[PDB]
Design a binder for this molecule. Structure first.
Ligand SMILES: [Mg+2]
Ligand SMILES: [Mg+2]
Ligand SMILES: [Mg+2]
Ligand SMILES: [Mg+2]
Ligand SMILES: [Mg+2]
Ligand SMILES: [Mg+2]
Ligand SMILES: [Mg+2]
Ligand SMILES: [Mg+2]
Ligand SMILES: [Mg+2]
Ligand SMILES: [Mg+2]
Ligand SMILES: [Mg+2]
Ligand SMILES: [Mg+2]
Ligand SMILES: [Mg+2]
Ligand SMILES: [Mg+2]
Ligand SMILES: [Mg+2]
Ligand SMILES: [Mg+2]
Ligand SMILES: [Mg+2]
Ligand SMILES: [Mg+2]
Ligand SMILES: [Mg+2]
Ligand SMILES: [Mg+2]
Ligand SMILES: [Mg+2]
Ligand SMILES: [Mg+2]
Ligand SMILES: [Mg+2]
Ligand SMILES: [Mg+2]
Ligand SMILES: [Mg+2]
Ligand SMILES: [Mg+2]
Ligand SMILES: [Mg+2]
Ligand SMILES: [Mg+2]
Ligand SMILES: [Mg+2]
Ligand SMILES: [Mg+2]
Ligand SMILES: [Mg+2]
Ligand SMILES: [Mg+2]
Ligand SMILES: [Mg+2]
Ligand SMILES: [Mg+2]
Ligand SMILES: [Mg+2]
Ligand SMILES: [Mg+2]
Ligand SMILES: [Mg+2]
Ligand SMILES: [Mg+2]
Ligand SMILES: [Mg+2]
Ligand SMILES: [Mg+2]
Ligand SMILES: [Mg+2]
Ligand SMILES: [Mg+2]
Ligand SMILES: [Mg+2]
Ligand SMILES: [Mg+2]
Ligand SMILES: [Mg+2]
Ligand SMILES: [Mg+2]
Ligand SMILES: [Mg+2]
Ligand SMILES: [Mg+2]
Ligand SMILES: [Mg+2]
Ligand SMILES: [Mg+2]
Ligand SMILES: [Mg+2]
Ligand SMILES: [Mg+2]
Ligand SMILES: [Mg+2]
Ligand SMILES: [Mg+2]
Ligand SMILES: [Mg+2]
Ligand SMILES: [Mg+2]
Ligand SMILES: [Mg+2]
Ligand SMILES: [Mg+2]
Ligand SMILES: [Mg+2]
Ligand SMILES: [Mg+2]
Ligand SMILES: [Mg+2]
Ligand SMILES: [Mg+2]
Ligand SMILES: [Mg+2]
Ligand SMILES: [Mg+2]
Ligand SMILES: [Mg+2]
Ligand SMILES: [Mg+2]
Ligand SMILES: [Mg+2]
Ligand SMILES: [Mg+2]
Ligand SMILES: [Mg+2]
Ligand SMILES: [Mg+2]
Ligand SMILES: [Mg+2]
Ligand SMILES: [Mg+2]
Ligand SMILES: [Mg+2]
Ligand SMILES: [Mg+2]
Ligand SMILES: [Mg+2]
Ligand SMILES: [Mg+2]
Ligand SMILES: [Mg+2]
Ligand SMILES: [Mg+2]
Ligand SMILES: [Mg+2]
Ligand SMILES: [Mg+2]
Ligand SMILES: [Mg+2]
Ligand SMILES: [Mg+2]
Ligand SMILES: [Mg+2]
Ligand SMILES: [Mg+2]
Ligand SMILES: [Mg+2]
Ligand SMILES: [Mg+2]
Ligand SMILES: [Mg+2]
Ligand SMILES: [Mg+2]
Ligand SMILES: [Mg+2]
Ligand SMILES: [Mg+2]
Ligand SMILES: [Mg+2]
Ligand SMILES: [Mg+2]
Ligand SMILES: [Mg+2]
Ligand SMILES: [Mg+2]
Ligand SMILES: [Mg+2]
Ligand SMILES: [Mg+2]
Ligand SMILES: [Mg+2]
Ligand SMILES: [Mg+2]
Ligand SMILES: [Mg+2]
Ligand SMILES: [Mg+2]
Ligand SMILES: [Mg+2]
Ligand SMILES: [Mg+2]
Lengths: 146, 97
RNA sequence: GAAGGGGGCCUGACUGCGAGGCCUGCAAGCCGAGCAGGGGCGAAAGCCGGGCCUAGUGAACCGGUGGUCCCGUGUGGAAGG
RNA sequence: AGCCUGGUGUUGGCUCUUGGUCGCGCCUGCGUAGGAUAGGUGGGAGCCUGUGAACCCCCGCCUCCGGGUGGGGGGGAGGCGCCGGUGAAAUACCACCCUGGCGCGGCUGGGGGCCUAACCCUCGGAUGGGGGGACAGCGCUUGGCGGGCAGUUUGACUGGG
RNA sequence: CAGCGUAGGGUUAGGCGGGACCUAAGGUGAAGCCGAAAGGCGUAGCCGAAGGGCAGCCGGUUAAUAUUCCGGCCCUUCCC
RNA sequence: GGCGAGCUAGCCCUGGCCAGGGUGAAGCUGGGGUGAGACCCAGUGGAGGCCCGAACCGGUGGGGGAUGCAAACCCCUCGGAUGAGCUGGGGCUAGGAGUGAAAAGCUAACCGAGCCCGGAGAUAGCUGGUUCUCCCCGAAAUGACUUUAGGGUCAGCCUCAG
RNA sequence: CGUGGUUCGUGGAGCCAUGGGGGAAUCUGGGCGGACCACCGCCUAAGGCUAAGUACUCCGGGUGACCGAUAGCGCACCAGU
RNA sequence: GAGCCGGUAGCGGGCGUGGAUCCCUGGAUGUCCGAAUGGGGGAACCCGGCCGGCGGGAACGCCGGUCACCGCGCUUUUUGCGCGGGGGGAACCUGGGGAACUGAAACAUCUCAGUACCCAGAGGAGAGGAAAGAGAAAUCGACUCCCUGAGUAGCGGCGAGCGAAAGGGGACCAGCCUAAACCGUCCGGCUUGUCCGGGCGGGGUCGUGGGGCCCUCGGACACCGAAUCCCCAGCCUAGCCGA
RNA sequence: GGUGGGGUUCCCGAGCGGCCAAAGGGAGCAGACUGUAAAUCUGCCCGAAGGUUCGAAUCCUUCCCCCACCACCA
């Protein structure tokens, strides 16, 4: 008997998987325990509409980090820093990179999860990477003066 | 009232027919009736006890139609009442217009 | 003057019929010449449709089995008769 | 009628254990004889091994323990067959089969334990707790026991019966 | 003559009995349960008494009624 | 399919009734007894499907009655009479059913299956009965078969038409 | 599987119905023409309603080779008394 | 259209051509019981709540009104309200159940018989009805009823007995609504989604298969037409003239 | 009528493809022991026809009987 599963059951696998089973089970365990539902032409329909709606906004969300990959992976933000000899007085941080990328080239990042480790104290050419899920490396130029 | 609340099935009278001898088609001289008498045949009737809105509704049905109790539960719109409840969930919902 | 006993060849302990009668409430029971087919024994005339004879039996119905042509529920088959 | 009873519905979860059959695979058998420890029939002088052999070292199970047999491996370029004969058979390698066994897998079976959630009992208390539990109860169906009840049968002749 | 025909008259209660009180067997029965139909069952409730509870005694009077009318002496419950 | 437990049987609820005598259980008390007891003896006490006997409940024997006073009675006699007692009121159980200290008793004056109405004009190879008149003819009581023998079928014998 | 309906009493037993078990498809789908198979046809099940032609006679009327007070209704009458 | 105040005279009184009695239609009144329905109850009796009224009227009593249960419907479930049901009826009708005597010259299957009867329900009728039919003809067309087919075909301890249909002739005549596809709306659940579900409207209703959706065709007065509603004749419920 | 088992030296009884005078038991005979009787002990000794292989008590067909069982009877 065909039920739509409401959570992974360990042999009778994960959510939405249509599994067939002795009615007794269905009626007196799964169903009253809200841990599944019987697969009607009615409910099979919402399930399709449920898988569509998911993989819609899912591969919609992959339309950002595909779009921010094809912009930030060429454009370079250049950072002014009070100079020193191959050492910075302040520190350019995630926060800074964020802002600079905004005022300059007109883009917006979080800046959560870029490189949080050790806000960068030197000058040079760095490649930092952005996120979530397949994603983009960025070029950032820390230079001189103000 | 031993009758299925969904299907409508109720007890029928039937004859119970006692036969002797060998089928004509086994080369017997043919079957013979030593008796015929009325019996009845009940529906195979069960409790389906189910939870709908607040409440716990109990249908008495032929084991045959047991599925339709659950079909009727998949019909859910707006009842905060007491048992009855199925008075609603019933033939109003089985047929209506 | 065989229906008795012995021997030889044989399967008529045939098939298809059956004038005419015995008997007889019915239904049965009985005897039967003769013709046809194909035979047996006999040189032939002839005899042979079990046994000297009179008891050794059981209507119908229901069913079995073998065969045959007959019928086969729109039709051909088949089921079943 | 009642009672007993197989199948099946209501009727579920998890294991353990067994069949039956089918497909495939891996084996099994041995009369002195041929040299012996060759199931049957056919193909057959070609093979198989260096797609790492014989001979032993562990090890498995079978055995009429003559041993058969595979893996591990020490292991390194041989081991075979025809020929020959007192048993029909001929004793490599390749298939299709028999007899028994095991191995896995397929559909169906039969048992045993535990679980709980159907079902049943219960709890001044409940969308719950405890107990029993897929039994029992109940439907359909199987066969049985069944004067507890029912309907009837239980001849005629006859110096009355 | 009559228990007979015709006709006329005759039975007076806050306290006696019963009811505007209680419950018994049983009955009936919102809930609920069962049953082809009819209908069976059933908790509470309700009904149900010669049981429980509740305030009147003595006497006179009529052809015919009287703890009922009358006389005397007592009492009960509701309302304000 | 109904109607019946106003009779009768059992049970349920709730009331009532049983003159008067007699016998004298246990217990208690006292006294005796003993190491202590068992026990004994008194008095007290007032038990019991205990005794006699009215009411009440019965129905033993005999007589009478027998178109009765009476569809179960009357007389004499007799059993029980604090109990498994009797009895009023209110209730419940019924027809293959009830109820029965059990006779197949009782269940509205006949119960081996109640009454009523219906199926119903059941069936009756049996018994009875079958109604004006005149005319002609005029039998059988045998055979065969028959779950047949006092019933039938065919035959035989009567009759009527051609 | 168990039964009922039909003329069909298990019969070769279909058709219509359905208590039990299993349990589909949407025209290239389904049911039927008496087991079953082929062919050739018929029809479209699992929702519902639908006058009239028909049955009856409490009731009113009209007729009778219907009765005439033991008949005719049980009752001609103050009878379901 | 002249007598009347029933059967019913009588006593004692009254009425009518200013049209009585009497007949027909409508209305009003209509105690109590009874489905009986405020609640009880041994039918025709008893006891109440609510609002209003009467009496001196608080107690008491009377009067009017209202108050059972069930179903359906909306409604904010609720305060509720609306509409309905209930019971009776001679026979007739359908449906649920369903005998025996009897017949078989015994008796079980069989018969009696789906009778009697009990129960539910319907109405002036009820049932049935518009083919998943018939059944051998390229056949017929709903249903019911009569005649016939026919005591045929069959059924049957192939006994006793039971007993169809097609067709033909008549009577009457009629055919419709829906479900789904699809479209639109409202509401509900939500893991707002071209989502699922319920409600309503549209759409569609058939077997030379139909319908939905897309394209083209012109698809225009249209014609048809109720079983529903309205009017009318006619008929019924009193009478009247009448040689 | 059907199904399943059989058939072995005098009785029972196992009976297998490499022969199985054919296990075994008891019966019989002859020995040993002996109050009687025994118990113990030792020795003696393929239903049928056909058919498949080199080999048949073994496998098949068939036939005959036995046992067993189920079923039917107009
Ligand atoms: Mg049966
Ligand atoms: Mg359940
Ligand atoms: Mg099922
Ligand atoms: Mg001779
Ligand atoms: Mg002759
Ligand atoms: Mg000749
Ligand atoms: Mg016969
Ligand atoms: Mg025959
Ligand atoms: Mg001929
Ligand atoms: Mg022919
Ligand atoms: Mg045919
Ligand atoms: Mg044919
Ligand atoms: Mg356990
Ligand atoms: Mg537990
Ligand atoms: Mg408690
Ligand atoms: Mg629990
Ligand atoms: Mg069970
Ligand atoms: Mg008897
Ligand atoms: Mg018996
Ligand atoms: Mg005799
Ligand atoms: Mg004599
Ligand atoms: Mg004698
Ligand atoms: Mg007088
Ligand atoms: Mg007073
Ligand atoms: Mg009272
Ligand atoms: Mg009271
Ligand atoms: Mg009751
Ligand atoms: Mg009292
Ligand atoms: Mg009192
Ligand atoms: Mg008083
Ligand atoms: Mg006085
Ligand atoms: Mg007096
Ligand atoms: Mg006074
Ligand atoms: Mg009594
Ligand atoms: Mg006294
Ligand atoms: Mg003392
Ligand atoms: Mg004393
Ligand atoms: Mg005394
Ligand atoms: Mg005494
Ligand atoms: Mg005495
Ligand atoms: Mg005495
Ligand atoms: Mg006496
Ligand atoms: Mg006497
Ligand atoms: Mg006395
Ligand atoms: Mg005495
Ligand atoms: Mg009493
Ligand atoms: Mg009786
Ligand atoms: Mg009895
Ligand atoms: Mg009587
Ligand atoms: Mg009596
Ligand atoms: Mg009797
Ligand atoms: Mg008579
Ligand atoms: Mg009769
Ligand atoms: Mg008789
Ligand atoms: Mg003469
Ligand atoms: Mg005679
Ligand atoms: Mg006689
Ligand atoms: Mg005669
Ligand atoms: Mg039948
Ligand atoms: Mg049939
Ligand atoms: Mg028969
Ligand atoms: Mg067919
Ligand atoms: Mg069909
Ligand atoms: Mg057809
Ligand atoms: Mg057709
Ligand atoms: Mg259809
Ligand atoms: Mg239709
Ligand atoms: Mg109609
Ligand atoms: Mg009339
Ligand atoms: Mg007279
Ligand atoms: Mg008369
Ligand atoms: Mg006269
Ligand atoms: Mg009379
Ligand atoms: Mg006058
Ligand atoms: Mg006028
Ligand atoms: Mg009037
Ligand atoms: Mg009342
Ligand atoms: Mg009132
Ligand atoms: Mg009442
Ligand atoms: Mg008032
Ligand atoms: Mg009615
Ligand atoms: Mg009515
Ligand atoms: Mg009927
Ligand atoms: Mg009978
Ligand atoms: Mg009889
Ligand atoms: Mg008879
Ligand atoms: Mg007779
Ligand atoms: Mg008899
Ligand atoms: Mg019949
Ligand atoms: Mg009506
Ligand atoms: Mg009509
Ligand atoms: Mg209809
Ligand atoms: Mg009949
Ligand atoms: Mg016709
Ligand atoms: Mg027409
Ligand atoms: Mg519509
Ligand atoms: Mg929608
Ligand atoms: Mg619609
Ligand atoms: Mg529409
Ligand atoms: Mg199309
Ligand atoms: Mg005139
Ligand atoms: Mg000696």
């Amino acid at each position: 008997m065909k039920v739509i599963l409401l959570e992974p059951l360990e042999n009778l696998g994960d959510v939405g998987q249509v599994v067939d089973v002795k009615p007794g089970y269905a009626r007196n365990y799964l169903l009253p325990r809200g841990l599944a539902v019987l697969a009607t032409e009615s409910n099979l329909k919402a399930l399709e509409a449920r898988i569509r709606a998911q993989a819609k906004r899912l591969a919609e969300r992959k339309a950002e980090a595909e779009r921010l990959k094809e912009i930030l992976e060429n454009l370079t933000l250049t950072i002014p820093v009070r100079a020193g000899e191959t050492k910075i007085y302040g520190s350019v941080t995630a926060k800074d990179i964020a802002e600079a990328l905004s005022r300059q080239h007109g883009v917006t990042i979080d800046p959560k999860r870029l490189a949080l480790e050790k806000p960068i104290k030197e000058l040079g050419e760095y490649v930092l990477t952005y996120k979530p899920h397949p994603e983009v490396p960025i070029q950032l130029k820390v230079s001189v003066v103000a | 009232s031993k009758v299925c609340e969904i299907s409508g099935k109720r007890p029928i009278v039937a004859n119970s027919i006692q036969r002797r001898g060998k089928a004509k088609r086994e080369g017997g001289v043919g079957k013979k009736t030593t008796g015929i008498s009325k019996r009845r045949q009940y529906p195979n009737l069960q409790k389906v006890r189910v939870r709908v809105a607040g409440q716990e509704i109990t249908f008495r049905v032929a084991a045959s139609h047991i599925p339709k109790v659950y079909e009727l539960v998949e019909r859910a719109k707006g009842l905060k009442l007491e048992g009855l409840s199925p008075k609603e969930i019933k033939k109003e919902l089985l047929k209506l217009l």
